[model samples]
Target chain A: MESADLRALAKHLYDSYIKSFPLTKAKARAILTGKTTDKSPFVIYDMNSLMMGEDKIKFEVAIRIFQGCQFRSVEAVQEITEYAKSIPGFVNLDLNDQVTLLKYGVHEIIYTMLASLMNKDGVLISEGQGFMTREFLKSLRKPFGDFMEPKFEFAVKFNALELDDSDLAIFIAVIILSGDRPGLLNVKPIEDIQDNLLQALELQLKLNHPESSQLFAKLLQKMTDLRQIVTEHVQLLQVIKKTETDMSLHPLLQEIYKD
Target chain B: ESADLRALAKHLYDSYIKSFPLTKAKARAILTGKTDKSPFVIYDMNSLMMGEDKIKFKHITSKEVAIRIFQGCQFRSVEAVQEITEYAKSIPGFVNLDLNDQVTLLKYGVHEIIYTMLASLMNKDGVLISEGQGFMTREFLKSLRKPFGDFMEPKFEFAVKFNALELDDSDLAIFIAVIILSGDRPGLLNVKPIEDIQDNLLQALELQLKLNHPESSQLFAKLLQKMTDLRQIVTEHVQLLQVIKKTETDMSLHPLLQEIYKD
Candidate 1:
């Protein structure tokens, strides 16, 4: 494609990605400050209470917050699905291939997006009204405790790369359109779309970050890191499923985790 | 603007690749005994302490070891000056500038580039590959007494933190160019053109950090702060070098270093 075509595609990808998540941090801050009346469906797990050593209450709050995060994770997947569908040739992929891509790639997308809500110390949850500190997450028990640390680790390092929304837009599209997901009936078209997306990303970086000669290579390395994170996430989900039999995951999440 | 940016970025990337063909991996491999022999050899202080003693008492003295380490670093610094000069000439607007302005920029900027490049040879534990031949421990460097002993502490700390940013050689090539083309350097004849060149490099650096370090929201600001810190480090270095020259009268400074050390 020509330079103009690549520029237009990059813009389109950015616009579509932004449309899926219109809730800016400023808006989240406004919500936290009570300048906005929008109430959050999620619960704010008080990290202080968790740290106070209230053994019974600790498990109770942990389970509740864990469940809340699950619901949020499901919603995040849905939003990602919306963004993926907007990719130029994505909807044209075979129905089964699209499903396979979403099933395999959703967790990776969710973890990558986690960087947006995160700082070095913790992440903002409950529409930014609640802050989940890293130490508090580590204080949790098995399965529940095992989760989030890896995500935070990934988010912290990923955040170091300092990608803005437009950069992330192309990144998320690249993740969803990736050709390596198992059980794809038609890999070539998906690979073709990914190649175009990658070209657009390269051109975008060249235009936007003129000094970063190795950025394209570093980003590809991050993708490998993302895959490792997803692998660990799947293993943790397996532990939650087998050990915490009472814990109920959302059907969509279960389906994604199913072997 | 987009088209121009693309072309400029391509040229800078090409220039960086051509000028510094040695990658960090290659450097690491050479340092770690995986490749060809290094030109400069440093006798490891640790090994020398373990009773190998074959080199004789005169060469094994603490003062002698300290002087040797300093000499090794000086040799590396001289080599760094050559590489940096070659890379600066490749920067798009560098050679086009006025001659005196160019020398003034390189004069002030070379130390910054040398220290920045030191991060490539350094690890998190305050050790650096000396002359691509041997490992130089921070403790050994600190044993040289007074100004010589503590001289590298600030730079070591800076290198440790800077290394965490994981900037590859290509990113560093432009960073070194930015350091060399700085308009803020005193004695610049044509301030406007230098500033113009520096501004472009800064934008390039800013964008590069954004992409290469997507997670670090404040990295650009942090790096600019680092540039300020580097200026302080260089000033302190010059003062310390002067002290070494005064106190250690027998310890000879490299002619090139002596020239750079002078005002």
Candidate 2:
């Protein structure tokens, strides 16, 4: 695929999902203060009641990972499927190949999207109620405290790049079209789509974050960091699940995390 | 045949001990428990432990060298863990499970799987701190800091006996996959699927061992027992993390580590 073809595809995705970027990090903060109701272009999870014991905290942490930093895991998977369907050759691949790509790539994409919710203040948490400041989460009780830090760590560093909807749309597509997942029936077509997305993303990054010389390189590195964090995320959930016998992980999550 | 396995374990340790030569004085000073001197002597597979990370250095303290090697070990061990994951996912029926289950198996089992890989890396003297680079003496590690040295105690204990089983690479690969597919991992949505996979692996291992180590009828059963032993080592590691969590007020454990070790 040519760069023109790639840019056209990325643009199609950016319009379809991001539409108009609403609530800049500053706007997100404004909403956190209960000033704005325009929760545009953001998927928010209301962690209300805030009923937390170590067990409840562990249960909620499981939900948070299964849910996104904002959206639930199923919602995130649906979006990943949507992104795959939009790619020209993705539907043409075998069904298992389609599932494999989504299964392997969805967690990375969700965290990538999560980078948007982050700001210098802390990650937006409790829906719009308050921010879970980095230090607060750090001091959080052992397992629960440990759960959100990696996401914030990545999110805080990634927000430093100042990417907008236009940039993230293409980056999300790049993560979705990954061909490297094991058990793929055919990899070449998916890799081709990924390469195309990467090229478009590179151009978009240069345009969007114009002053930064290594913006694309840094964004790519963040994707690597995201994978490691997801690895940690999975471990955290597993440990808690093992520790809390009375708790039940959500069905969608059980399917997603089931080995 | 049982005697043979015992001898094989000794030979494996002998080969491993040569890689880490120590000064005579240091060798004589070896201990099997913690000391203040052991704080910076740790070699973790993940770079969560203390130290300023640098690629190469000049006039570096022993702590820095240990940290550098620890980071180096982390680099290799991470890939090794990934291989175990890939091996599980590549199984026939394994892919049919809910994706969540697939990840769950890998996450809970990765530590246990890691210790199994480490068993092969151990010798009578101590385990290799970094592959092909240096050896961590059992006594030397004991001399290191709290919880850091405390962590290695059970691992070395298990490794000594496990290495004696003398299972080859092929045997180890099947055993590691068996460890990951275990249905015992908590919070599994459908235990039946994983139990099926583990059963299949156990059967495969049984048949393979029959052909490969035919003279040792009890070997397969003994291998199964190692899984239980490996779990205890992990339990101790988690306990050590708990102690550190409570006592080391200034310590900044890796976020990933804090989760895995969480009770």
lDDT scores for all predictions?
0.70, 0.60
Per-residue lDDT of model 2, residues B4-26, tens digit only? 43343333234323322332223
- Candidate with best TM-score: 1
**lDDT at B136, model 2:** 54
Worst 10 residues of 2 chain A by lDDT: A40-49
DockQ of structure 2: 0.01
Q: Can you write out model 2's per-residue Cα lDDT over A79-176, one digit (the tens) per residue? A: 66666677667788888888787777878877887666665545654333344555555555657667767777677767767777777777777777
TM-score of each: 0.47, 0.44
What is the lDDT for A162 in model 2? 72
In model 1, the Cα lDDT at residue B213 comes to 78
> Candidate 1 at residue B42, lDDT?
28
